[PDB]
Amino acid sequence: MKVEEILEKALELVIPDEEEVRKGREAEEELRRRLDELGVEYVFVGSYARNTWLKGSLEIDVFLLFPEEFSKEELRERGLEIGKAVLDSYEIRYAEHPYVHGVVKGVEVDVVPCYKLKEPKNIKSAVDRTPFHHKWLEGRIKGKENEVRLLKGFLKANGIYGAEYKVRGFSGYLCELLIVFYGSFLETVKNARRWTRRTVIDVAKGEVRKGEEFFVVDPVDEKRNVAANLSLDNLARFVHLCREFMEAPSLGFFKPKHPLEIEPERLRKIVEERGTAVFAVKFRKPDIVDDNLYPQLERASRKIFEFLERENFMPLRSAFKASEEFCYLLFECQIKEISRVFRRMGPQFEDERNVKKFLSRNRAFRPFIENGRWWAFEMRKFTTPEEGVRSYASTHWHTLGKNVGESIREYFEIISGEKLFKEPVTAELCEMMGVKDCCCM
Amino acid sequence: MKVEEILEKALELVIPDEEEVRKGREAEEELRRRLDELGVEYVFVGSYARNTWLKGSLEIDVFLLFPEEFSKEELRERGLEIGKAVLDSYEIRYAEHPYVHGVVKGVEVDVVPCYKLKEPKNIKSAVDRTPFHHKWLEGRIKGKENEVRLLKGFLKANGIYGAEYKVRGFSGYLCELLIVFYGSFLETVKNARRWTRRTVIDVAKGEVRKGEEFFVVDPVDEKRNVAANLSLDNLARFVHLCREFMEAPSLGFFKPKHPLEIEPERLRKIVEERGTAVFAVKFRKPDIVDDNLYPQLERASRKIFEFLERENFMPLRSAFKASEEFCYLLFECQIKEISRVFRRMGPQFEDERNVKKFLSRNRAFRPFIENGRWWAFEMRKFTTPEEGVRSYASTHWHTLGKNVGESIREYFEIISGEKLFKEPVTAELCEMMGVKD
RNA sequence: GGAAGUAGAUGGUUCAAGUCCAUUUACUUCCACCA
RNA sequence: GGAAGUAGAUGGUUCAAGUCCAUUUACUUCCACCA
């Protein structure tokens, strides 16, 4: 299979077919009629209005253009008022910028209020660049919309499409900019192989530059890094994907993998081969949006992780899962059990004052002089990493993220061994320990 | 109690009785005759020849004065013959400088060939300072002989008297200098408390001066560090014992403290209480003098310790013992068992050539990326500190001292649990673990 | 909500804290939720 | 025999270890065995 042949087949995975374009076309018209009837300024932007949305995930963005002078609170009431007035059914869940999600004639719509600006310098709301993004792309993306989709499907299938916190990947917009820059998906990929953590792509200036971090300049706002929330590791994954793809291209790369059911037994055997302690801290899921949730789960992971490390449990890797009603903070450590006694350092032998303060303390064991300074043996209050975290999470819940922290305080438990393998975390477990052959399609 | 009171009763244990004195006096009379019907130039030196030896251990030092043109050839051969022809029974074991050790009418004697110089500068044989030590000390010590005797007794009861590598403590010539310097035992203990690791003591200039490290200057060799072999930790032990003695003076500071050994079962209980892995590497004690052995054992000890720590077993401390037949290298780790899997660091995601290489290796688990570099899981070859040191000891014998390495090469074993507790290391295991009572 | 910087104030730990664990006031950004 | 210092000779481990683990020559001391 030549590289150009795989792509022709890959287009079938990404070009929306007619039924979905029509559904979209008549959703759009209905939207128009409704927003006309209300006599409001609106515009269609995003992937629908540029024809770069993916087969299977049609969503229309309608943007409301308000006077710059409106208060943030006004922007909010009116935005919602109109969004609610126009959608067949709706749902309002956001993290900071207010907008309403909904459905019109079976199709998904964001209706998002923003400020009508003359320039996208000194943005007032965080969505203000969007109409300009559209304006800039409108006539550079014609005839390339399929190169965009290839890139989006390619990233989607390797789980790095989306700039949201759940993903820390590539936005659709970022994808569009890349095609405008390179000219095709193929050219994008060919070049990505040479991207580095210092790479700066400046599209408006048509230039690739070195800098302090991976930076993709927005043509609409030179200060914006379109790749701001692309995690370093996902960058590295993408360049790698590219290098692999060029060497051995297949339809594989455009097909997504789904984790496999793993018998809790295979899982038991694997864990005892590695000879490690594995456990999750399980707690009720705070009822909040993903974009609030995930940073906090990351915070929790790290915080506990660093505890495990400084208490010498030598943790290998951490992971986390949000499920329907619970969350899980997963860890794997090299030390299943540590000794009760440990060393604590005292002062040098010349500090009469402090030494005699130091060996004042009542201890089970005679303290000793080494390398000219004193040393004491103390007892740990926990000897296994599970006990360690039972203590840590009970007493440091406040540090663990505002919402998860409050959750952990109210309740949590530590699960390990087989009780843990029957829990919906096998996917993360395999991923975390790098278990071979546990994903598919 | 009141302090001078304490010294009174304590003098009785450092001072030799007429019984022991006479014993020497007449062994000295025999010596003086036997040496003079051979026309060999000689002088007596050391604690014997300045009335500063201890109740118990009595030794006599006889020094053979030799012409300087004599090579290390004629020095050894003649100087040995002489002692061999003077003593009743003798040994000739030594590390560098040759001498003969022996018995004359039931008392300990040392006869030592050396050069009769005039200048101690540009020294020839290792001991040549010693007759000059005496010349300097002869009349200077007169009176203060008791105050010396107290210092030695104090150090011996607290196990820090001597200079040999077994003790790395205080030479009995350093002990004399301190008394000479500070006047008495009480003033010596008094100022010791205020010594630092950089204290510099000079006697032929009487200056409590400071410098680069703990350096007591010999009168007869300005450039000689009489405290050279005193270990930092033992200097640290001394100035603390002094601070302790001063606050609560007791007879038990001259009573050699005995670690009356502990039951294999009370030991067992303690280690499971501490919850750590204690074990020893045991091998055939090489046939070498102490002053060769211990530095070597220290070396062997340290290398394994360092292995263990970089291997992440978190060793607590080391020790070592040498018996009739065997040496023991003792260790305690916080980690009885580590996981099989571990983390190996790959290159950074950019370096394409090296990534391929890192990825080409067969492993049981997929490698991963973390903060922009590749990592892999790999498997350990050992998971307990015992198995670990078995490996290190087999692979690295050559680096564990000349004679101790060779011995471990032939044979060694890893010794732990109750098998270990019935080996003659009970005392050192305590000292090491900080056990009380 | 999360992260980065600035100017601080606390508590705990420890012989010892500008250096470890945490708490907290003010300013300055920035990211996610739309693109 | 151990330690310190001067100029080098490698081998093993590893994606690469000029940095991790060891091997080896020349030279300049020091220290213990007596005090």
What is the distance between the alpha carbons of residues A371 and B34, in angstroms, rounded to a whole number?
Answer: 50
A437 touches B: beta carbon within 8 Å = no
Q: Provide, as residue numbers in chain B, all residues whose Cβ is less than 8 Å from the Cβ of A210.
A: none
Q: Which of residues 176-195 of A touch strand C (CB under 7 A)?
A: none
CATH superfamily of A260-339+384-441: Poly(A) polymerase predicted RNA binding domain (3.30.70.590)
Q: Protein B314 CA to nucleic acid D12 C1', in Å? A: 25
CB B343 within 8 A of CB B350: no
Q: Which of residues 32-61 of A touch strand C (CB under 7 A)?
A: 45-47, 59, 61
From 3.40.190.170, 3.40.630.30, 3.30.460.10, 3.40.1740.10, which CATH number describes the A16-143 domain? 3.30.460.10
Q: Measure the CA dihedral A76/A78/A79/A85, to 10°.
A: 140
8-state DSSP, B152: H
Indicate the residue type of B169: G
At B322, give phi and psi (nearest 5°).
Answer: -130, 130
Contacts of B239 (CB under 8 A, 6+ apart): A349, A350, B192, B193, B194, B195
What is the distance between the alpha carbons of residues B367 and A9, in angstroms, rounded to a whole number?
Answer: 31
Q: In chain A, whose CA is at the least distance from the CA of B343?
A: A316
For the record, the structure tokens of A256 come out as: 């997504």
Which residues does residue B413 pair with via DSSP β-bridges, in sequence order?
A: B282
Q: What angle do CA A393, A394, A399 make, to 5 degrees?
A: 55
Distances in Å between the Cα of A369 and the Cα atoms of A174, A375, B198, B222 are 62, 6, 17, 31
Q: Are strands A59-66 and B42-45 parallel, antiparallel or unpaired?
A: unpaired
Write the burial class of residue A387 (CB in 10 Å: 0-12 exposed, 13-18 middle, 19+ buried). middle
Q: How far is A351 from chain B (nearest CA, A)?
A: 9
B276 touches A: beta carbon within 8 Å = yes
Q: Provide, as residue numbers in chain A, all residues whose Cβ is less than 8 Å from the Cβ of B273.
A: 340
CA-closest candidate to residue B351, choices A154, A236, A14: A236
At A108 the three-state DSSP class reads: strand
CB A226 within 8 A of CB A136: no
A353 touches B: beta carbon within 8 Å = no
Indicate the residue type of B334: Q
CB B72 within 8 A of CB B56: no
CATH 3.30.460.10 range(s) for chain B read 16-143
B314 touches A: beta carbon within 8 Å = yes
How far does Cα B28 stand from its chain's mean position? 31
| H or E element at residue B369 | strand B368-370
Contacts of A393 (CB under 8 A, 6+ apart): A281, A304, A400, A408, A412
Q: How far is B161 from chain A (nearest CA, A)?
A: 18
Instruction: Based on DSSP, count helices (H) and strands (E) in chain A, helices before strands.
Output: 15, 17
At B39 the three-state DSSP class reads: coil
A94 is in an annotated binding site: no
Contacts of A410 (CB under 8 A, 6+ apart): A283, A284
CB B368 within 8 A of CB A428: no
For the record, the structure tokens of B92 come out as: 């000739």
CB B123 within 8 A of CB B44: no
Find and list the nucleotides of strand C having atoms within 7 Å of a protein beta carbon.
1-3, 14-16, 20-24, 30-35
Looking from the CA of B148 toward its CB, the CA atoms found within 13 Å total 25
| H or E element at residue B344 | strand B341-348
DSSP output for B68-121 = TT--HHHHHHHHHHHHHHH-SEEE---SSS--EEEEETTEEEEEEEEE--S--S
B85 touches A: beta carbon within 8 Å = no
Q: Protein B211 CA to nucleic acid C17 C1', in Å? A: 30
CATH 1.10.1410.30 range(s) for chain B read 1-15+144-259
Indicate the residue type of B39: G
For the record, the structure tokens of B393 come out as: 């000891």
Contacts of A299 (CB under 8 A, 6+ apart): A400, A401, A404
How far does Cα B274 stand from its chain's mean position? 28
Q: Which of A334, A359, A373 is the best substitution to test chain B (most B C-beta atoms within 10 A)?
A: A334
What is the distance between the alpha carbons of residues B133 and B177, in angstroms, rounded to a whole number?
Answer: 10
At B100, give phi and psi (nearest 5°).
Answer: -120, 130
8-state DSSP, A165: T
Q: In chain A, whose CA is at the least distance from the CA of B372?
A: A233
| H or E element at residue A257 | none
Q: What beta strand segments (E) does A86-206 contain?
A: 89-91, 100-104, 107-115, 199-202
The answer to whether B377 contacts A274, with C-beta atoms less than 8 Å apart, is yes
A334 touches B: beta carbon within 8 Å = yes
For the record, the structure tokens of A201 come out as: 């792509």
B291 is in an annotated binding site: no
What is the distance between the alpha carbons of residues B325 and B370, in angstroms, rounded to a whole number?
Answer: 53
Q: Protein B143 CA to nucleic acid C28 C1', in Å? A: 79
Q: Provide, as residue numbers in chain A, all residues whose Cβ is less than 8 Å from the Cβ of B435.
A: 365-366
CB A364 within 8 A of CB A287: no
A225 touches strand C (CB under 7 A): yes
3-class SS shares of chain B: helix, strand, coil, % to 5:
40, 20, 40
- Portion 168-227 of B in contact with A at CB < 8 A: 193, 196-197
Q: What beta strand segments (E) does A301-407 contain?
A: 315-322, 326-333, 341-348, 368-370, 373-379
For the record, the structure tokens of B292 come out as: 């060769």
For the record, the structure tokens of B101 come out as: 């050790």
A302 touches B: beta carbon within 8 Å = no
What is the distance between the alpha carbons of residues B70 and A417, in angstroms, rounded to a whole number?
Answer: 80
Q: Which of residues 163-182 of B touch strand D (CB under 7 A)?
A: 163-165, 171-173
A344 touches B: beta carbon within 8 Å = no
Q: In chain B, whose CA is at the least distance from the CA of A236?
A: B349
Q: Provide, as residue numbers in chain B, all residues whose Cβ is less than 8 Å from the Cβ of A373.
A: 236
- Portion 87-106 of A in contact with B at CB < 8 A: none
What is the distance between the alpha carbons of residues A226 and A200, in angstroms, rounded to a whole number?
Answer: 11
8-state DSSP, A161: B
Query: B123-139: string of b/e by CB count within 10 Å (b at 16+)?
Result: bebebbbbbbbbebbee
Please determine, looking at this structure, whether the domain spanning B340-383 carries the CATH number 3.20.110.20.
no
Q: Protein B344 CA to nucleic acid D17 C1', in Å? A: 13
Class of domain A1-15+144-259: mainly alpha
B152 is in an annotated binding site: yes
Indicate the residue type of B189: V
CATH superfamily of B260-339+384-437: Poly(A) polymerase predicted RNA binding domain (3.30.70.590)
Q: Protein A286 CA to nucleic acid C9 C1', in Å? A: 32
- Closest C1' nucleotide to B46's CA: D35
Q: What angle do CA A205, A210, A211 make, to 5 degrees?
A: 100
For the record, the structure tokens of B413 come out as: 């074993």
- Closest C1' nucleotide to B60's CA: D34
At B19, give phi and psi (nearest 5°).
Answer: -40, -60
Q: Provide, as residue numbers in chain B, all residues whose Cβ is less than 8 Å from the Cβ of A342.
A: 334
What is the distance between the alpha carbons of residues B8 and B380, in angstroms, rounded to a whole number?
Answer: 63
What is the distance between the alpha carbons of residues A284 and A404, in angstroms, rounded to a whole number?
Answer: 8
CB A164 within 8 A of CB A259: no
CATH 3.30.70.590 range(s) for chain A read 260-339+384-441
Contacts of A384 (CB under 8 A, 6+ apart): A277, A336, A337, A338
How far does Cα B31 stand from its chain's mean position? 32
What is the distance between the alpha carbons of residues A377 and A248, in angstroms, rounded to a whole number?
Answer: 58
Indicate the residue type of A100: V
B366 touches A: beta carbon within 8 Å = yes
Interrupted after residues, chain B (C–N over 2.5 Å): none
CB A329 within 8 A of CB A281: yes
A398 is in an annotated binding site: no
At B284, give phi and psi (nearest 5°).
Answer: -65, 120
**What is the number of other CB atoms lying within 10 angstroms of the CB of residue A337?**
16
The answer to whether B276 contacts A341, with C-beta atoms less than 8 Å apart, is yes
Indicate the residue type of B402: K
For the record, the structure tokens of B237 come out as: 């032990």
Distances in Å between the Cα of B127 and the Cα atoms of B45, B113, B120, B216 are 12, 9, 11, 18
CB A115 within 8 A of CB A70: yes
How determined? X-ray
What is the distance between the alpha carbons of residues A379 and A382, in angstroms, rounded to a whole number?
Answer: 9
CA-closest candidate to residue B334, choices B380, B396, B278: B278
Write the burial class of residue B170 (CB in 10 Å: 0-12 exposed, 13-18 middle, 19+ buried). buried
Q: Which of residues 65-94 of B touch strand D (CB under 7 A)?
A: 94
Write the burial class of residue B151 (CB in 10 Å: 0-12 exposed, 13-18 middle, 19+ buried). buried
Q: In chain B, whose CA is at the least distance from the CA of A367?
A: B434
Q: Measure the CA dihedral A292/A296/A297/A298, to 10°.
A: 120
- Portion 226-245 of B in contact with A at CB < 8 A: 232-233, 235-237, 239-240, 243
B23 touches A: beta carbon within 8 Å = no
Residue whose token pair is 């077993």: B313
Q: Provide, as residue numbers in chain A, all residues whose Cβ is less than 8 Å from the Cβ of B347.
A: none
DSSP output for A51-73 = T-PPTT--EEEEEEEE-TTS-HH
What is the distance between the alpha carbons of residues B175 and B192, in angstroms, rounded to a whole number?
Answer: 12
What sign for the dihedral angle of Cα A363, A369, A373, A377?
Answer: negative
Resolution in Å equals 2.7
For the record, the structure tokens of A110 come out as: 């964001």
